[PDB]
From a paper:
The final model includes 370 residues (residues 2–187 of chain A and residues 4–187 of chain B), nine ethylene glycol molecules, two MPD molecules and 367 water molecules in the asymmetric unit. The two outliers, Pro106 in chains A and B, are actually found in a cis conformation in both chains and have clear electron density. An analysis of PA1994 using the CastP server revealed a deep pocket (15 × 6 × 7 Å) enclosed mainly by helix H2 and strand β7, with additional contributions made by strands β10–β12 and the loop between strands β14 and β15. However, the binding pocket is hydrophobic in LolA, whereas the PA1994 pocket is acidic, suggesting a more hydrophilic ligand. The entrance to the pocket in PA1994 forms a long and narrow groove (20 × 7 Å) composed of strictly or highly conserved hydrophobic residues (Ile102, Pro106, Pro108, Phe165, Leu170 and Ile178) and also involves the dimerization interface (Trp13), suggesting a hydrophobic component of the ligand and the likely requirement of dimerization for binding. The extensive dimerization interface observed in the structure, in addition to the SEC/SLS data, suggest that a dimer is likely to be the bio­logically relevant oligomeric state of PA1994. The swapped β-strands appear to participate in stabilizing the conserved cavity.
The crystal structure of PA1994 from Pseudomonas aeruginosa, a member of the Pfam PF06475 family classified as a domain of unknown function (DUF1089), reveals a novel fold comprising a 15-stranded β-sheet wrapped around a single α-helix that assembles into a tight dimeric arrangement. The remote structural similarity to lipoprotein localization factors, in addition to the presence of an acidic pocket that is conserved in DUF1089 homologs, phospholipid-binding and sugar-binding proteins, indicate a role for PA1994 and the DUF1089 family in glycolipid metabolism. Genome-context analysis lends further support to the involvement of this family of proteins in glycolipid metabolism and indicates possible activation of DUF1089 homologs under conditions of bacterial cell-wall stress or host–pathogen interactions. The PA1994 gene of Pseudomonas aeruginosa, an opportunistic human pathogen, encodes a protein with a molecular weight of 21.6 kDa (residues 1–187) and a calculated isoelectric point of 4.9.
Residue numbers in the entry:
A (entry chain A): 2 to 187
B (entry chain B): 4 to 187
């Protein structure tokens, strides 16, 4: 009654991408990510917080996305041993075996397998990642591989059929500097 | 606590999304859009307040982008005399009665509601044009023509010759800005 909402979408288009600002503590991160919906062409903002254990196993994830379609939330709990549940404590068996989350579009999440696995040069690991693509935030299990090439370079590969592969340049804490052609640290 | 910022290198076509809350004498809006040079997103929050004649009296802007936070606070007397939030006079904007914000069709409402044009009637205005994300205002010559109650011809008078026909609702709020904005 006090006010009335009016919403406008632009019809003009310009090329655009993501911008993410993250704050990192020892056992948790909080981030604000802004990016275009790649189907609709309209912007969204994703706010999220991740919390992990001493061994860099994910224990909690909270997401809040705002877009033209409305506000969507997601709350996930993980036991650090591959068992997931929602914020209501309902088990999510479809994610069994996932130890790490991978959020698109964010190169933050590549840090988890790096820090968790502690790979040596030349060592390869195949993982089951819980892949969550903004803005829809509908998680699904995804097979991935990481190979340590040297201290600052990791070979990332999709294992589900795309054959996508990339070499990540990371810093001494395992944070991505360059995700070549996809993300740059500012 | 360590701060980390990443820019995307991938590109996808994008545009503005604006959600505005309107009251009798003021509006507060949240506008998200891409920077048209950098490819990176920004968010503009703004609030406008006007008198009963639809003359702008105050405007406050807050933009967040990869370049940082930028703020702008304008005061107008409704008679074409402007000041910043600290009271310092802004002679460069002398004679402006209306603000025009890009990218927003909201601000087309001001001349429509203020001018009281008859059907077929054209008026030139001096608009204070404020383009996000930089928010560096400048006076600009524009013209409005009432075609009928629900259609106004907009003209840029600075030399582009850009013209548009705006479809508006019963309160002068833009429904269609053809090829630029659509009401959802």
């Amino acid at each position: 009654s006090r006010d009335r909402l009016y919403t406008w979408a632009g019809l003009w288009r310009s090329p655009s991408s993501s911008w993410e600002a993250l704050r990192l503590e020892d056992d948790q991160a909080e981030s604000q990510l802004r990016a275009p919906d790649e189907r609709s062409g309209l912007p969204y903002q994703l706010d999220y917080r991740l919390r992990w254990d001493a061994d860099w196993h994910l224990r909690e994830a909270v997401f809040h996305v705002e877009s033209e379609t409305g506000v969507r939330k997601l709350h996930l709990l993980a036991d650090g041993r591959g068992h997931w549940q929602d914020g209501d404590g309902e088990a999510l068996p479809a994610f069994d075996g996932c130890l790490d989350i991978d959020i698109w579009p964010s190169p933050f999440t590549n840090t988890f397998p790096i820090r968790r696995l502690g790979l040596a040069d030349g060592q390869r690991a195949e993982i089951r990642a819980l892949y969550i693509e903004a803005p829809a935030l509908e998680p699904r299990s995804m097979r991935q591989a990481y190979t340590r090439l040297d201290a600052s370079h990791y070979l990332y590969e999709n294992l589900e059929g795309s054959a996508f592969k990339a070499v990540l340049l990371v810093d001494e804490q395992g944070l991505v500097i360059d995700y070549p052609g996809l993300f740059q640290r500012l």
